Amino acid sequence: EVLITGLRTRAVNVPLAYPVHTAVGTVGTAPLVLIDLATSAGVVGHSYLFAYTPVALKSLKQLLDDMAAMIVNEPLAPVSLEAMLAKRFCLAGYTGLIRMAAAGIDMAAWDALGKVHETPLVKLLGANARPVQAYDSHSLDGVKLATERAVTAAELGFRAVKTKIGYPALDQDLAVVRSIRQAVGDDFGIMVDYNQSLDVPAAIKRSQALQQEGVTWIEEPTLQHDYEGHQRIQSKLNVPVQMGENWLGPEEMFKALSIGACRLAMPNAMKIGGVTGWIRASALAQQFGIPMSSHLFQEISAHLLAATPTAHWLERLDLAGSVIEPTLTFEGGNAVIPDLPGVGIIWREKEIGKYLV
Amino acid sequence: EVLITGLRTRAVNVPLAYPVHTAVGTVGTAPLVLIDLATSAGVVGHSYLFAYTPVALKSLKQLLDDMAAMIVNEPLAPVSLEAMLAKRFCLAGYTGLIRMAAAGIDMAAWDALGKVHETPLVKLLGANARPVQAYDSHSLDGVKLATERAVTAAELGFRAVKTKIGYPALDQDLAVVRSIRQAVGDDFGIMVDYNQSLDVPAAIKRSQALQQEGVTWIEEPTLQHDYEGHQRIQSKLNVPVQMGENWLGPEEMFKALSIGACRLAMPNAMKIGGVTGWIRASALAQQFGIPMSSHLFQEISAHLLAATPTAHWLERLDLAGSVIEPTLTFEGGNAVIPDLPGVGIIWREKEIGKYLV
Amino acid sequence: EVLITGLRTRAVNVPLAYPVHTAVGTVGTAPLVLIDLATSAGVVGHSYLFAYTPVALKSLKQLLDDMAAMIVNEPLAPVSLEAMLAKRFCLAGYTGLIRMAAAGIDMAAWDALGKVHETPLVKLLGANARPVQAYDSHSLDGVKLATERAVTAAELGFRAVKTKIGYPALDQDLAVVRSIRQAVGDDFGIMVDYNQSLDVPAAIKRSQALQQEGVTWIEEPTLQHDYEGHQRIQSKLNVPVQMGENWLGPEEMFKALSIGACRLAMPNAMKIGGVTGWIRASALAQQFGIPMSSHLFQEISAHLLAATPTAHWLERLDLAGSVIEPTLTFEGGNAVIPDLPGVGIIWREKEIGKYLV
């Protein structure tokens, strides 16, 4: 009855604020692909994609433009849609860019299915809107700016910030961490992110030191695909090893969890397979006794997490704010889901035009 | 001293012959991306990429065009190059399309490094050119055509063909297999490919039946990423489970081998990471006691396999023949490496122009 | 096209400097076998072998003299050569002295293949020359001399020395370690080597104490072949257990890594199988997330490590300096690969004659 009637994509390069100086590389602007999925019902669904690097921007768009044919005239059934894409790419590799594109479609699809029903996504999922404690996500900003950015966080009501470490010397890592703690006090969270920049032995040395300082969690210490490696690091700690931003599909998640690679997880809405993949990852975490947090996509992650049995933390890191309405809000360090059908994504057309690639 | 000075790409849609009717989907023409990598030495390296589906053709090209910047002015050092790309994409995901593109670059790089030295690739790798038994690769062609295509194979000196099964009924699978055997006799190889089209239990039922018929190997019975699944199937057989065409990187290989997912392997030159990744996969197979065969890219695979300690079979499946010279040859069902520097890839410019996308 | 035309060997007993008083036994002079491998191309390849003890000197030479027949008239293809030797000794045992001799041949072969191409080895391997942090390797020298030898190290720009411990009493071990630290400060590396001189329980007691003192790594605590044992020791530590100097072939490496016997590795160019074996060990370390350092053969190790994805530390321990040119250099505690084709080994004929056995 409800058919997908079209797919429109726009590739922009949006302004951020600070610029995710990461534990390995850094980011000035943000490359995104905005997605409009048209339906026979007179409702348009929305989503966006993050390209990490501009190198992949035109590619990711071109890929979606070419997939539009596969999905038009198909029924608006995300679960079915997803299955169909998985069979169509089984040879090329239903992962990477292909999977990210599929995820963008799923997200829009679910958004449109939410509007069809004049219901907020979380509600459609069968749950009640609840706030979610979130943490302010910073970068590899050095002692001073890291410290400055945390006082502001807390000033805005945040109860934890996340900072990027992995300086040439463990000593620097610590420096940064201590300055923030002094600035904010013992009743505050400090999550650190090594951005997969260390080897296993080094991660053990550094993590132990930090453990002492009292970090909330140590995220992506080594190469992301090295599950076993992560297990080895974790095995030497009390503090939780955090991971999962790079899991392409619930299938990669399953693998990592199967070996006890981590104590916490934080799937990425795009990489995990959109709404459809999330639901699945959430069931996994549950069975595995893994508190599940989010990575980017605060808009949809807010709804998603409220339907997650082991929901943990939402990550505040506004990639898309310059081109969308400020529907998602934060009340006392807790994200509040807007009371709008679907995900609550409303475009800022005039701005969009400013950043078109 | 030797620098990369440029990257040119052309996307064509080449004519094949028969059309890889596969155990799940089928292929009429072939979408490729041809790569020219220019050097300060006045030598151009070559490679090509297979896109499986035209959906990904423009995308894959656009991706390479955008990566050209990363590699220009870099030294012509494939091993170093590769490392550098791996750090640059650690966030986006050094797999999928990104990895395939990286592999295409590596292949060209190694080709150019071979010309720089006026030496054939295999030679540069430290080995001697030797023929490699190959098998003629067919598709899901039905009883009649499968049978017709095998008599010809053997007529051309082949000692084994590979066919695609996975018909709605096990009975059909068998039919196809028996007709070929009758046509060719007991002293002939028959490799079957299910193209990841079955569940685990069904693969056990079907594989056992075939086991009886005497197949050389059962390839990709279930979903490719389901390593454990493959282990379960294998555990119930005597005949070898074959896999590895979808392993994106030696890192995915390692995982599968670690659980004893298969008895044989056949990495894909593109997906495994080009020459650089191959060398690594080959060391793995060795330690693991896994006879290693190839998947597509007969041109480079010929050289590659001769430097493989556990070299098994080369797969004949000419994707690129319409746009390149017939340097690779087959003598009595054995592939013969041409005595040309590099890989031996020479373009057919006039033809290329015919298929430009 | 390029054939091996001859094999010449000379056995010398070279002067050292200090004399590797080891955590079990000690060394005054150095017994080596120098290898010249002649080719149809008018290029001679070089390598040398270390005999550890003079007991094995004449034996090792005699063994190479007798193998010369096997390799003459063979093509200059190290990878092929190596395979051929492995089949020829499968009965006698392709390990021990036999393997060491094979490794010496491989090394020369690769050196000659580098000259054939007027290219530095590392370059031929596909990588870029880069410096490698190295550490000055000392012996079981006692408190005073150990301390004296470190001040000089650092004076020469080294950032870490390695010392031999394993005194009758843990107290002595510590003494030595503390004196060096005082002498050099907290920003300096101290690697310790027990030379396989302890039992498992004792290694646990001693390693824990040292862990406190802050050693960089604990190397070969127990009998080298006792992998499991090493795993037990490691399991009780935070500090890395280092091993691999005695691994005869990548096959022994694989075994040790398979059980998690260590956190770091340091293969020996000779024992691991020359260039050919190295390439393989390096792929293993990679997959296993094991930072790989070297053992002896600083000349070739320098090139080797630059092509190692998980390259760690180069060990400075000049066995051969009295009979070769000072091509390898150290700039600020980093080894610099000479810009000479092959490995860069140039003999000092007049000196050689002084030490001929």
Add this chain to the structure above:
Amino acid sequence: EVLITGLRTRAVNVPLAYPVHTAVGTVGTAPLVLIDLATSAGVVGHSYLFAYTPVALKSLKQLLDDMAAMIVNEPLAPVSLEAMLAKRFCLAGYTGLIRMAAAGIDMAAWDALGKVHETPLVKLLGANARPVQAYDSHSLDGVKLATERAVTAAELGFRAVKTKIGYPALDQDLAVVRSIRQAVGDDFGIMVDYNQSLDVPAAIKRSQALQQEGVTWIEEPTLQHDYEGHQRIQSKLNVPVQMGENWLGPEEMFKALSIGACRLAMPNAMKIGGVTGWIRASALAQQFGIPMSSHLFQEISAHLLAATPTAHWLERLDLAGSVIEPTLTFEGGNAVIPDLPGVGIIWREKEIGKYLV
């Protein structure tokens, strides 16, 4: 009180009879090193070593000549001696040629310790002389000669022969096996030896076929050091996988047994560490529920096996017969230990002189 006063070695190249055409390579004459170990007691101990290949003959001798110094003036205490050699070579590698030489010394030492006591070795070991069923060991002799050689065996009272297979085709393997069976009947043993000439998958195919024919055991199907590999093969069979001729030390044995690599074992007196190592391997087999047979050295193996709790089969393969007295005898396919002190090795001085290298 009893000291070792000297070590004499002679390297001969002895005539055989048939010539161990092996499942990979073949042998015309036999290269041995005969050992005389002098004592303060006026008793000379004896042993011999097998060099597999003449390539290693001069080397092995030279090695023993150089070790003589280490052992002279030492007490005639094999157990202590052995320990001492193990510490002295811990750096060079107490395996390979070095270990073989050590084993030759141990064997002589024990022989001399037997003469000192005017007691037969087995007796000194604490056991009673008993016959041991043995099997006649043949080579890769083809259908006809294999068949001829078995009729004779049985004619001489043997109840089982061992033949070498591994022909280019499984069909040949079978041919050979069937002809012998026809020739001898169902109440006869047929042990087959693949000489490590197959890959894992192929070994599974071939072994299963043979299993059908009814072989006594399948020996060294794949590369000897590939324990895991052997475990995989064994796991697919009912018939016993036999191995252990290449285990250098009880330490290599332990490893293989630990993973269930085989159902039977057959250590080599030389490679396992002489008498001293045997005693140890025998305790291992016992605990592991592994029937233990021998490899070469029928003279000492006869005594050894009678002191083995899980003693199985003795292998008849007379390497040394041309230079020693016919003390060891066979009565009805059972080896009979001579009633002479020590091992019973008496040289044939006049003959020795004929084969001196």
